[PDB]
Design a protein around this ligand. Structure first.
Ligand SMILES: NC1=NC(=O)C2=N[C@H]3C(S)=C(S)[C@@H](COP(=O)(O)OP(=O)(O)OC[C@H]4O[C@@H](n5cnc6c(=O)[nH]c(N)nc65)[C@H](O)[C@@H]4O)O[C@H]3NC2=N1
Ligand SMILES: NC1=NC(=O)C2=N[C@H]3C(S)=C(S)[C@@H](COP(=O)(O)OP(=O)(O)OC[C@H]4O[C@@H](n5cnc6c(=O)[nH]c(N)nc65)[C@H](O)[C@@H]4O)O[C@H]3NC2=N1
Ligand SMILES: [Mo+6]
Length: 765
């Protein structure tokens, strides 16, 4: 095979060059306006040293099963087995747990970003097999907008975080002031959940070309700041709600806010105002009070409030500030401030929670929806409570107004996810995993999660199979044929093939496949989309002509004029919101009735577990544990891209020159970052891009424990979740709080370390 083949991924559409059956280059689609340099690593992930070659069973589990010593999971002592042996064992273990403990004994939430593709949807496929086996405990929500997706339905009556934004071209013609509040769109627009079109890049360029005023509110001087030469505000992390309250307070005290908008489109501002004015707690939430907490000068807070009230302003917020203790307060207070400014539903004004994610704002086409394989259908937990569940079987927990009991789980099955990187408080989690009798993982790269499994099955990538998928989570630019580029490597198999074999052994083979093969499933999804298109007046070709061209693109009709909340603004009685009042709920009677101490019935400033310069806080530096520039989470850490950012081989840590100098740390030194939960190594990069008092260690580094049998073992590489706490945002959402982290840093003076996470375990070589 010598030629080229087009396909797609979370990073975009591309064409691969193939030479004697090997992919040798991935070249960006010629219509991609701003491709990601991460494509190089996506191609490298098919072949790197951490590619999973064969099915493996952890030696202890292979010998003793349920009586295994579980304290050694992750030490790398695996045994290679055949596919028939491994498939029989997995089917036997699913059957035994289902039969002994019921569906409540199997956890199949398998949270994860996997790969796009309507057929090869590993996590849906997992749940299709588990439903056929008798059922499972699922997870609810995500780590992404854990709090925001739960509080928004109560405030604005919709999900809001994953819904279309006022279109980019509408902003270029009407916005005078664009605010990126805890958002770094240049960084986070490189990927999509479905294939990305990178629509934010022309949208950002158009704002810059129009000369629109841009303000960034973030502890780090990011590439979004640099792109625009933006006015940059640097709040101490976790204090954005105080800043917003000081802005709101200024708008009332100077008599500037939109009283008519508040009276006509909102409910409960009259119960929020006494709090804001300090009538209930003797503490007026003034700009000065906000400076005391956040460090942002009081006069700067008042001038921004003034500026925002006097100009058509769009508040484009990102999600780091809701991935923290009391995370629900951030976007609730943001909507409350935007309601006082009175521009919601006006062209170019209001707020948007998705301008930094998967092309939100890219004009939607008139094309049809594309759907794929389905799963064939307490039993559900908030996703981030998985370790609490394992440690407290039968215990009660609160979630969004209802109380339930944790199921008693004995097996976990994970595919397309990396919990030994994404979950908070690694040391606690490692100990809690000993409650599981059996842990099964599918991946194509030797992540920490695969290293810690009892049974490891090698999955294929999307580049070794055929699939179909939309281009554009919001734009619906078109539909792509994700064509097979190379044959499956080593003994890797698709998740579909693996679960069909397991289901077959359970006597449910035919039900799992539904009588179809790979192209029979794909053609069925295509034809359904084509039927809907024909009925909508969007004619598409027949499946074989579509597949030969490789893509179908759809036309934009009125999508470039979309203004979010315009129909509500234009007539709120005719087009009410989905809340109990039909209005924006600044005070929520439904939340009040829950009686949750950590989620009051209006936006409130509350002390988090720990914050930079908080009264009595133990550790001195905040860790901006944010999304990586050159990975998708942990994805691509085991590729050639790593050498472009590693420092002495470790994950990098940005540190301000003043904080480095106080510890005698030089640029490029190996340093230990530690607190009461754990300790890791990173390689420092000294730079004033991070504000003083803050260090930046991205999430996604592959945890590489020095000795898994040692409690509190040093991580040799730099997984920042060895340092996070595992607590819920509050009882409302129970979201993860992965960015509520303080720690100390010192030049490292312990034993030298050898990195073992970027080569396969010896027996799997
Ligand atoms: N401290 C902290 N700060 C944060 O900001 C933070 N972010 C959180 C958020 S928002 C999220 S969304 C999570 C993400 O955590 P998530 O577990 O989703 O991270 P990924 O590195 O995308 O894991 C995806 C895995 O799927 C594998 N994979 C891809 N395709 C396939 C396939 O077809 N088959 C199989 N079997 N495997 C496949 C990949 O190789 C990869 O190992 O991390 C969360 N964790 C976080 N912690
Ligand atoms: N390149 C890339 N890699 C990814 O892993 C990736 N993940 C995707 C996912 S699953 C999601 S959920 C989104 C994440 O989108 P999200 O907006 O949650 O991204 P983060 O990088 O966690 O934070 C964005 C900015 O918040 C700033 N920040 C941190 N703490 C604070 C604070 O207290 N206050 C303020 N004002 N700013 C703060 C950080 O400095 C960072 O620049 O990105 C998506 N896009 C992604 N792109
Ligand atoms: Mo996310």
């Amino acid at each position: 095979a010598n030629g080229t083949v087009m396909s797609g991924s979370h990073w975009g559409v591309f064409t691969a060059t193939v030479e004697n059956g090997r992919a040798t280059a991935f070249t960006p689609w010629e219509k991609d306006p701003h491709p990601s340099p991460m494509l190089a690593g996506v191609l490298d992930s098919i072949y790197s040293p951490t590619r999973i070659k064969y099915p493996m069973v952890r030696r202890e589990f292979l010998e003793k099963g349920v009586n295994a010593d579980r304290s050694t999971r992750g030490n790398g002592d695996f045994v290679r087995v055949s596919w028939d042996q491994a498939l029989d064992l997995v089917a036997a273990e699913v059957k035994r747990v289902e039969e002994t403990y019921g569906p409540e004994g199997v956890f199949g939430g398998s949270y994860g970003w996997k790969s796009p593709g309507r057929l090869h949807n590993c996590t849906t496929l997992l749940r299709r097999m588990l439903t056929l086996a008798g059922g499972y405990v699922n997870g609810a929500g995500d780590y992404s907008t854990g709090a925001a997706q739960v509080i928004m339905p109560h405030v604005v009556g919709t999900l809001e975080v994953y819904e279309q934004q006022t279109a980019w071209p509408v902003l270029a013609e009407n916005t005078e002031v664009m605010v990126f509040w805890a958002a770094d769109p240049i960084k986070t627009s490189q990927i999509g959940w479905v294939i990305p079109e990178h629509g934010a890049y022309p949208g950002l360029e158009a704002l810059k070309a129009k000369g629109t005023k841009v303000i960034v509110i973030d502890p780090v001087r990011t590439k979004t700041v640099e792109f625009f030469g933006a006015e940059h505000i640097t709040p101490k992390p976790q204090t954005d709600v105080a800043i917003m309250l000081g802005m709101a307070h200024t708008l009332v005290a100077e008599d500037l806010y939109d009283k008519d908008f508040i009276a006509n489109y909102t409910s409960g501002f009259d119960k929020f105002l006494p709090y804001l004015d300090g009538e209930t707690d003797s503490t007026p939430k003034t700009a000065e009070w906000a400076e005391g907490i956040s460090g942002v000068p009081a006069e700067t807070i008042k001038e921004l409030a003034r500026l925002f009230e006097s100009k058509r302003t769009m508040l484009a917020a990102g999600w780091s500030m809701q991935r923290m203790h009391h995370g629900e307060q951030a976007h609730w207070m943001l909507v409350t401030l935007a309601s006082m400014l009175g521009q919601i539903g006006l062209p170019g004004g209001g707020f948007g929670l998705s301008y930094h994610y998967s092309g939100g704002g890219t004009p939607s086409t008139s094309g049809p929806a594309l759907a794929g394989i389905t799963d064939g259908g307490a039993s559900v937990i908030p996703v981030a409570r998985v370790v609490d569940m394992l440690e407290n079987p039968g215990a009660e927990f609160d979630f969004n107004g209802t109380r339930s009991k944790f199921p008693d789980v004995k097996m976990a099955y994970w595919v397309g996810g990396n919990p030994f990187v994404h979950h908070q408080d690694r040391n606690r989690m490692v100990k809690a995993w000993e409650k599981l009798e059996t842990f099964v993982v599918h991946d194509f790269q030797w992540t920490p999660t695969a290293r810690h499994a009892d049974i490891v099955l090698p999955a294929t990538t999307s580049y070794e199979r055929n699939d179909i998928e939309t281009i554009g989570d919001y734009s619906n630019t078109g539909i792509l044929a994700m064509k097979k580029i190379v044959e499956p490597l080593y003994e890797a198999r698709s998740d579909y093939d693996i679960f069909a074999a397991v289901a077959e052994r359970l006597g449910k083979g035919a039900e799992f496949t539904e009588g179809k093969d790979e192209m029979g499933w794909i053609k069925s999804f295509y034809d359904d989309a084509a039927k809907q298109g024909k009925a909508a007046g969007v004619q598409m070709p027949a499946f074989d002509a579509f597949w030969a061209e490789g893509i179908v693109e759809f036309p934009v009709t009125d999508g470039a004029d979309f203004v979010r909340y315009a129909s509500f603004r234009e007539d709120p009685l005719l087009n009410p919101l989905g809340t109990p009042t039909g209005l924006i709920e600044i005070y929520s009677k439904n939340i009040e009735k829950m009686g949750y101490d950590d989620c009051p019935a209006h936006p409130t400033w509350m002390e988090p577990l720990e914050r930079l310069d908080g009264p009595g806080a133990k550790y001195p530096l905040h860790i901006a544990a944010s999304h990586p520039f050159n990975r998708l989470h942990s994805q691509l850490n085991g590729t050639v891209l790593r050498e472009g950012y590693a420092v002495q081989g470790h994950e990098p840590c940005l540190m301000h020159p003043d904080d480095a100098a106080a510890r005698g740390i030089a640029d490029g030194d190996v340093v230990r970052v530690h607190n009461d939960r754990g300790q890791i190594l990173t390689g420092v990069k000294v730079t004033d891009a991070v504000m003083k008092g803050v260090i930046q260690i991205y999430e996604g580094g592959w945890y590489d424990p020095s000795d898994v049998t040692e409690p509190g073992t040093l991580d040799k590489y730099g997984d920042v979740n060895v340092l996070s706490a595992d607590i819920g945002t509050s009882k409302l959402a129970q979201g993860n709080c992965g960015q509520t982290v303080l720690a100390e840093v010192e030049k490292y003076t312990g034993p030298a370390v050898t990195l073992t996470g970027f080569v396969a375990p010896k027996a799997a070589e």
